[PDB]
Amino acid sequence: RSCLENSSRPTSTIWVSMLARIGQRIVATLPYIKQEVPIIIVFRALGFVSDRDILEHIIYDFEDPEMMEMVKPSLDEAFVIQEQNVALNFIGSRGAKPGVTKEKRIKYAKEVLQKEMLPHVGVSDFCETKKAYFLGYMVHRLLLAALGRRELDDRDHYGNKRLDLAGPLLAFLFRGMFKNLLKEVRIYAQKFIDRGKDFNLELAIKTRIISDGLKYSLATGNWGDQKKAH
């Protein structure tokens, strides 16, 4: 569950899972993609065309052939995609809104690989070399749990849990309530520049968005808006 720091984007979770079963193919369940994409396709989309270079991100010791023959089966799987661009077309061909032109699809699969998956490592212009390391670490840690070299994580361990006190509980509200009022001052600048007159904000600032969203959720207990309280 990757999250940045109280961003207006919520948490966004990858999944680098491995299939039951050739056998032993690793997939990836990126966000904003409906199907799943094998991982070497992602490492090529992030921009690593060579095969040794994906593997240096996944396997730090090339000297134990124990973990080499575990990622071969997925390395043979995507031998059909070899450059970055057909690789983006693979992921971009799967979105929620798949673009009708190819170029729309690569603009999609380049935007989800820079802001939707793994944001905490970075959402900048060039962070693929460290989203690549942190992805290869997720695969590597999966291969350790499958080779049996490391015990699986316990969902109940309190080290794996955070408590949301009255601070984040409220900064989760005050983001949505502060986006609603920028949607209000938007429409109010709109109905007013289009008459070509000039627009004023004192009347555009709807004060009853904060003052009443807070007071509502703190009164009923429903942590949301009143329109979607069930």
Question: b/e string for 57-74 if b means 16 or more Cβ within 10 A?
Answer: bbbeeeeeeebeebbebb
**Residue 32 vs 178, nearer CB to other proteins:** 178
Residue nearer to other proteins on the CB measure, 20 or 165: 165
Kindly tell me which of 133 and 223 has the beta carbon lying closer to other proteins: 133
Question: Mask 119-158, x = binds other proteins (CB under 8 A)?
Answer: -xx-------xx--xx--x-------x--xxxxx----xx
- Residue 229 binds other proteins (CB under 8 A): yes
- β-strand partners of 18: 26
Residues 29-48 contacting other proteins, CB under 8 A: none
Q: How many residues sit in the footprint of other proteins (CB under 8 A)?
A: 79
User: Which of these ranges, 30-38, 89-97, 99-107, 211-219, lies near other proteins under the rule CB under 8 A?
Assistant: 211-219
Site for other proteins in 89-118 (CB under 8 A): none
Smallest distance, other proteins to C-beta of residue 175, A: 5
Closest residue by Cα to residue 40 from 91, 74, 7: 74
Nearer to other proteins, 102 or 179 (CB): 179
- 193 contact partners, CB below 8 Å, separation of at least 6: 199
Q: Is residue 6 a contact point for other proteins (CB under 8 A)?
A: yes
CA-wise closest residue to 28 among 40, 39, 13: 39
Q: What b/e readout covers 148-168, taking b as 16+ CB neighbours within 10 angstroms?
A: eeeeeeeeeeeeeeeeeeeee
Residue 166 lies near other proteins (rule: CB under 8 A): yes
Q: What is the DSSP letter of 55?
A: H
Q: Is 178 in the site for other proteins (CB under 8 A)?
A: yes
CB nearer to other proteins: give 51 or 99: 51
| H/E stretch holding 14 | none
- For residue 27, the cross-strand partners are 38
> What residues numbered 62-91 form the site for other proteins, per CB under 8 A?
62, 65-66, 68-69, 72, 75-76, 79, 82
The number of C-alpha atoms within 13 Å of 45 and in the hemisphere containing its C-beta is 29
What is the closest distance, in whole angstroms, from the C-beta atom of residue 196 to other proteins in the complex? 9
| Minimum CB distance to other proteins, residue 100 (Å) | 25
Q: CB 211 → other proteins: shortest distance, Å?
A: 4
Alpha helices, DSSP H, located in the chain: 39-45, 51-58, 65-75, 84-92, 102-111, 128-146, 168-193, 210-220
